[PDB]
């Protein structure tokens, strides 16, 4: 049977980067020709594999993490990068194997009145470990005094909204990102192109 690739790409709503989605795969054949007709222009960078020969590959697990960020920040979705997104929202490992798919979503995710529903984490006492997830909304303690759950000086809400309007520059427009990771369990498979 066919893998639910359209459930990840053709999904109506995408999650915030601080709360990135995660779709488990199992018991299906995976052909990626569906992916090629997805956007007028999109990026398909793979780490250790090529997107063409990757149709002849077998896997035990693939994980599709999807979220929305600025076009400015797609560069941070790569091994060894730094920034608010790589450090405080979504980190890729250095030996990461898999691919990254990103395409402009202005038509879907930006509004003339401004779409403010997509958030990213701005404050964290420590950078994330590769593939770690943090959906907590605790006030960040930036100074000497405790915050008692109240926002103020040295006491900041950790999340901050994107502003997505269609008249912004492309760097500031929303981009939908999908990260494929290739996990190989010591068991048999269900990820082999026809």
């Amino acid at each position, epitope marked *: 049977n066919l893998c639910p690739f359209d459930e990840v790409f053709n999904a109506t709503r995408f999650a915030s980067v601080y709360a990135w989605n995660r779709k488990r795969i199992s018991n299906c054949v995976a052909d990626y020709s569906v992916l*090629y007709n997805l956007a*007028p*222009f*999109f*990026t*398909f*960078k*793979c780490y250790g594999v*090529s*997107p*063409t020969k990757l149709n002849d590959l077998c896997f035990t697990n693939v994980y599709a993490d999807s979220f929305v960020i600025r*076009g*400015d920040e*797609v*560069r941070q979705i790569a091994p060894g990068q730094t920034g608010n997104i790589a450090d405080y929202n979504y980190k890729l490992p250095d030996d990461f194997t898999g691919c990254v798919i*990103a395409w*402009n979503s*202005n038509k879907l995710d930006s509004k003339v009145s401004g779409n403010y529903n997509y958030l990213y984490r701005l404050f964290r006492k420590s950078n994330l470990k590769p593939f770690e997830r943090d959906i907590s909304t605790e006030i960040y303690q930036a100074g000497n005094k405790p915050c008692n759950g109240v926002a103020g000086f040295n006491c900041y809400f950790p999340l901050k909204s994107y502003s997505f309007r*269609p*008249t*912004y*520059g*492309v*760097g500031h*427009q929303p981009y939908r990102v999908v990260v494929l990771s290739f996990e190989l369990l010591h068991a048999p498979a269900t990820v082999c192109g026809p």
Partner: nanobody
Amino acid sequence: SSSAVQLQASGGGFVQPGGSLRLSCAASGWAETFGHMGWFRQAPGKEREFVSAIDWWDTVHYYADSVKGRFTISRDNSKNTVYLQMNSLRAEDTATYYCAYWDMDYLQNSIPVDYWGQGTQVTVSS
């Protein structure tokens, strides 16, 4: 192998010295990164010469000395298209203009181009 990009050009024709013209180039397909777009040109009998380039995010702009101050390269915010505004065109601007794409995040030099478009004739004369 790791990219497949098509470039569609528009604009060009015949103008007079001092006149203006707007060239456009549209990118489609897939690539490794949101790379740079730009223009080359080739005068009759001469070799191809770099004209202008821009990163995908309209934050970096490069111009050849022969066109600095006269040409301006910009990007559409709703289309995957890049534009070349050509002001005060001179007779030496007469050339076949080629759109070009680099699949890089940073553009060191103009020289291993990844993709071209079909030529676009621009002639400046009376």
